[PDB]
Design a protein around this motif. Structure first.
Motif, PDB file in Angstrom:
ATOM      1  N   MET A   1       0.905  -1.257   0.037  1.00 33.23           N
ATOM      2  CA  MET A   1       0.069  -0.133   0.085  1.00 33.23           C
ATOM      3  C   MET A   1       0.977   1.332  -0.021  1.00 33.23           C
ATOM      4  O   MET A   1       0.749   2.252  -0.783  1.00 33.23           O
ATOM      5  N   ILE A   2       2.093   1.199   0.740  1.00 40.80           N
ATOM      6  CA  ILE A   2       2.652   2.495   1.079  1.00 40.80           C
ATOM      7  C   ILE A   2       3.195   2.506  -0.252  1.00 40.80           C
ATOM      8  O   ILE A   2       3.513   3.389  -1.045  1.00 40.80           O
ATOM      9  N   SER A   3       3.805   1.199  -0.689  1.00 38.44           N
ATOM     10  CA  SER A   3       4.493   1.077  -1.913  1.00 38.44           C
ATOM     11  C   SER A   3       3.415   1.507  -3.007  1.00 38.44           C
ATOM     12  O   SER A   3       3.983   2.439  -3.842  1.00 38.44           O
ATOM     13  N   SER A   4       2.192   1.229  -2.932  1.00 35.93           N
ATOM     14  CA  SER A   4       1.225   1.502  -3.865  1.00 35.93           C
ATOM     15  C   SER A   4       1.400   3.082  -3.970  1.00 35.93           C
ATOM     16  O   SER A   4       1.304   3.925  -4.952  1.00 35.93           O
ATOM     17  N   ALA A 172      -7.289   6.420  -6.500  1.00 37.09           N
ATOM     18  CA  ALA A 172      -7.426   5.043  -6.077  1.00 37.09           C
ATOM     19  C   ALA A 172      -6.686   5.007  -4.500  1.00 37.09           C
ATOM     20  O   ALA A 172      -7.251   4.389  -3.888  1.00 37.09           O
ATOM     21  N   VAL A 173      -5.736   5.543  -4.204  1.00 36.33           N
ATOM     22  CA  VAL A 173      -5.093   5.412  -3.099  1.00 36.33           C
ATOM     23  C   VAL A 173      -5.863   5.728  -1.960  1.00 36.33           C
ATOM     24  O   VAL A 173      -6.299   4.987  -1.119  1.00 36.33           O
ATOM     25  N   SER A 174      -6.820   6.833  -2.105  1.00 32.98           N
ATOM     26  CA  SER A 174      -7.790   7.224  -1.013  1.00 32.98           C
ATOM     27  C   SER A 174      -8.498   6.231  -0.840  1.00 32.98           C
ATOM     28  O   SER A 174      -8.888   6.008   0.389  1.00 32.98           O
ATOM     29  N   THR A 175      -9.279   5.825  -1.923  1.00 33.30           N
ATOM     30  CA  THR A 175     -10.035   4.591  -1.534  1.00 33.30           C
ATOM     31  C   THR A 175      -9.797   3.679  -0.865  1.00 33.30           C
ATOM     32  O   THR A 175     -10.234   3.218   0.177  1.00 33.30           O
TER      33      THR A 175
ATOM     34  N   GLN B  16      -6.201  -6.077  -3.068  1.00 33.29           N
ATOM     35  CA  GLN B  16      -5.159  -4.929  -3.171  1.00 33.29           C
ATOM     36  C   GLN B  16      -4.418  -5.187  -4.287  1.00 33.29           C
ATOM     37  O   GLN B  16      -4.022  -4.064  -5.043  1.00 33.29           O
ATOM     38  N   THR B  17      -3.813  -6.584  -4.480  1.00 36.98           N
ATOM     39  CA  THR B  17      -3.037  -6.806  -5.772  1.00 36.98           C
ATOM     40  C   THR B  17      -3.600  -6.440  -6.963  1.00 36.98           C
ATOM     41  O   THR B  17      -3.179  -5.492  -7.834  1.00 36.98           O
ATOM     42  N   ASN B  18      -4.920  -6.667  -7.156  1.00 37.29           N
ATOM     43  CA  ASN B  18      -5.667  -6.455  -8.301  1.00 37.29           C
ATOM     44  C   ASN B  18      -5.575  -4.982  -8.494  1.00 37.29           C
ATOM     45  O   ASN B  18      -5.550  -4.436  -9.727  1.00 37.29           O
ATOM     46  N   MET B  19      -5.898  -4.176  -7.567  1.00 36.45           N
ATOM     47  CA  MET B  19      -5.987  -2.550  -7.873  1.00 36.45           C
ATOM     48  C   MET B  19      -4.670  -2.229  -8.143  1.00 36.45           C
ATOM     49  O   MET B  19      -4.568  -1.469  -9.058  1.00 36.45           O
ATOM     50  N   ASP B  20      -3.540  -2.698  -7.294  1.00 33.15           N
ATOM     51  CA  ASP B  20      -2.356  -2.090  -7.772  1.00 33.15           C
ATOM     52  C   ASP B  20      -2.097  -2.526  -9.363  1.00 33.15           C
ATOM     53  O   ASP B  20      -1.642  -1.408 -10.156  1.00 33.15           O
ATOM     54  N   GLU B 155      -9.777  -0.958 -15.139  1.00 29.90           N
ATOM     55  CA  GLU B 155      -9.093  -1.514 -13.891  1.00 29.90           C
ATOM     56  C   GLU B 155      -9.362  -0.968 -12.755  1.00 29.90           C
ATOM     57  O   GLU B 155      -9.654  -1.451 -11.759  1.00 29.90           O
ATOM     58  N   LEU B 156      -9.415   0.535 -12.918  1.00 27.50           N
ATOM     59  CA  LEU B 156      -9.626   1.311 -11.648  1.00 27.50           C
ATOM     60  C   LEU B 156     -11.101   0.888 -11.125  1.00 27.50           C
ATOM     61  O   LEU B 156     -10.888   0.652  -9.890  1.00 27.50           O
ATOM     62  N   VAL B 157     -12.021   0.640 -12.016  1.00 23.16           N
ATOM     63  CA  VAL B 157     -13.493   0.236 -11.591  1.00 23.16           C
ATOM     64  C   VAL B 157     -13.187  -1.138 -10.606  1.00 23.16           C
ATOM     65  O   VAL B 157     -13.596  -1.290  -9.692  1.00 23.16           O
ATOM     66  N   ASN B 158     -12.212  -2.051 -11.465  1.00 27.25           N
ATOM     67  CA  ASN B 158     -12.009  -3.325 -10.826  1.00 27.25           C
ATOM     68  C   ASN B 158     -11.541  -3.131  -9.461  1.00 27.25           C
ATOM     69  O   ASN B 158     -12.052  -3.562  -8.257  1.00 27.25           O
ATOM     70  N   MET B 159     -10.426  -2.088  -9.242  1.00 34.37           N
ATOM     71  CA  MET B 159      -9.824  -2.256  -8.217  1.00 34.37           C
ATOM     72  C   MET B 159     -10.431  -1.542  -7.085  1.00 34.37           C
ATOM     73  O   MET B 159     -10.537  -2.127  -6.090  1.00 34.37           O
ATOM     74  N   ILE B 160     -11.589  -0.788  -7.410  1.00 32.84           N
ATOM     75  CA  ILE B 160     -12.137  -0.162  -6.583  1.00 32.84           C
ATOM     76  C   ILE B 160     -13.237  -1.181  -5.866  1.00 32.84           C
ATOM     77  O   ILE B 160     -13.235  -1.507  -4.455  1.00 32.84           O
ATOM     78  N   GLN B 161     -13.654  -1.970  -7.061  1.00 32.96           N
ATOM     79  CA  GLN B 161     -14.640  -2.939  -6.631  1.00 32.96           C
ATOM     80  C   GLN B 161     -13.758  -3.885  -5.652  1.00 32.96           C
ATOM     81  O   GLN B 161     -14.300  -4.343  -4.418  1.00 32.96           O
ATOM     82  N   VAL B 162     -12.761  -4.362  -6.125  1.00 31.36           N
ATOM     83  CA  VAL B 162     -12.087  -5.489  -5.641  1.00 31.36           C
ATOM     84  C   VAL B 162     -11.583  -5.069  -4.053  1.00 31.36           C
ATOM     85  O   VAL B 162     -11.825  -5.410  -3.181  1.00 31.36           O
TER      86      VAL B 162
END
Lengths: 186, 186, 186, 56
Positions: A1-4, A172-175, B16-20, B155-162
């Motif tokens: 996360m921090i990494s992210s 993204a990060v905030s979420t 998290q990975t997915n979002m990343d 992806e962002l959508v994905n990441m948020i949902q994930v």
């Protein structure tokens, strides 16, 4: 996360950089048609290089600019006579009061570097040689390496999009963080 | 329960990975239209592979980049002459000061792997061969295996949902634990 | 829901595609009035097809373009004489220095495919035959299958609306997710 | 290299004839110039769309 966060951060940083670069884009006048830089020296005697053709003859003759800096090596211009000219080869010839037309009052020299990328920017499109650049190689226009003397928004687009990107990145990060907080604690 | 925690945890990790991953998505320039990677070497002589087409000619001739790295095998470029070109096949030809136009100053080679998945990421979209990848197979553009050189939010959508998902996951876990605690002791 | 997301996503993807397609819309010059493509070959000898009529006679005679590519099969043009002409049938005739007016210096051939849809786009409106396209069938202009040689914003509208659509789509998805989150947990 | 070597001759012989003794472009350019303006417009909308989309 921090990494992210870092990852996002880095990207965001780039985005600004990109935009900035994007921003950075969009009297005798001599231009260099092809490769090469004019060689110039400061009062200290340090050598610098620039494509900028604009020169003025100052109080001293030597090719002095708005500041007074002259040109190398052995060729000045401290008279009135009639006029003066810079040939394609860089030879400076003049018509003069001392009842003569000299040829090669002096000839301008041009320099090339193995890698321009290495050059260190002084500012005002003036550059200095570095280890990375390699030593300057000297020549004259119209010979060997050098050609004769001759005589943007897209970036903005980029920058805007790139700038946008970080905005996304932050989002993204905030979420996630929110997610974390929401998670904390379940 | 602990298992469930693990299960949730694992899912959350993925999210998290997915979002990343989601985050990770959304001068001569040569591009590869189809499959294949350019082959590149470090100062050590180790070989690496990359689709990235951006190259600069450094102080040394050899196809050196912003860093100075050249290209293989037997073909460099240390002159001024006029210009240079990279053909569709990858042949490099130039017009030069040494009064000649060479063809195949050198020809770029391309590589393909049995599994790209196996490749180990160095970073900056540069990859190294591994046991899993298989050995690189070499060829030239426009022949055999290789085509000629040419010339996100979801992806962002994905990441948020994930990301959301884990938040849910945590929620479920917490309740149970609370339940347990409530249970403890009845 | 995820499915819905997918559904929305797919639509959104299309919308972009549509817009893009929308974007993609809105010296001897020979045009083909009806169906058919000119046949062209690369230095490799591979055959390609294109409606684009623009040709230049290069240093070699053979119908070479801005690149130098010639035309098939047995008919070139490496002289000055007077002029040259391309008849409606595709016959090339010339008036020449070698004191003669040749007819059918060569005649251009035209090709048709069972399905144009199958053709693989090289780019620059040049296409290559595929399994799906079927083999090229050859003929000449003015005979059989081929006619003689002769001598947009709406898309934008679409694209905008289509693009809009995804925006709507996303909106719907978000609400639900919010709803879910609101729901979570009741 | 691309041009090939020059081939020499005299006027009135062989290859050479004897010595003897626009706005449309503008139209084009304007339209073409216009085109990009359109192009930009399309791009902007999408981006806006994206932004609008972000986040739904």
């Amino acid at each position: 996360m921090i990494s992210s966060l870092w990852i996002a951060k880095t990207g965001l940083d780039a985005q600004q950089t990109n935009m900035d670069v994007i921003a950075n884009n969009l009297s005798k006048d001599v231009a260099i048609k092809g490769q090469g830089f004019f060689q110039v020296m400061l009062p200290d005697g340090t050598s610098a290089y620039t494509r900028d053709g604009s020169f003025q003859v100052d109080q001293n003759g030597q090719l002095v600019t708005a500041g007074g800096f002259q040109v190398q090596p052995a060729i000045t211009i401290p008279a009135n006579a009639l006029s003066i000219t810079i040939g394609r080869d860089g030879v400076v010839s003049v018509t003069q009061q001392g009842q003569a037309a000299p040829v090669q009052v002096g000839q301008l020299n041009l320099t090339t570097f193995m890698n321009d990328t290495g050059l260190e920017s002084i500012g005002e499109n003036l550059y200095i040689e570095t280890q990375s650049s390699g030593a300057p190689n000297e020549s004259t226009p119209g010979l060997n390496g050098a050609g004769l003397l001759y005589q943007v928004a897209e970036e903005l687009v980029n920058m805007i999009q790139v700038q946008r990107a970080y905005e996304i990145n932050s989002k993204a990060v905030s979420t996630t963080d929110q997610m974390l907080q929401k998670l904390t604690q379940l």
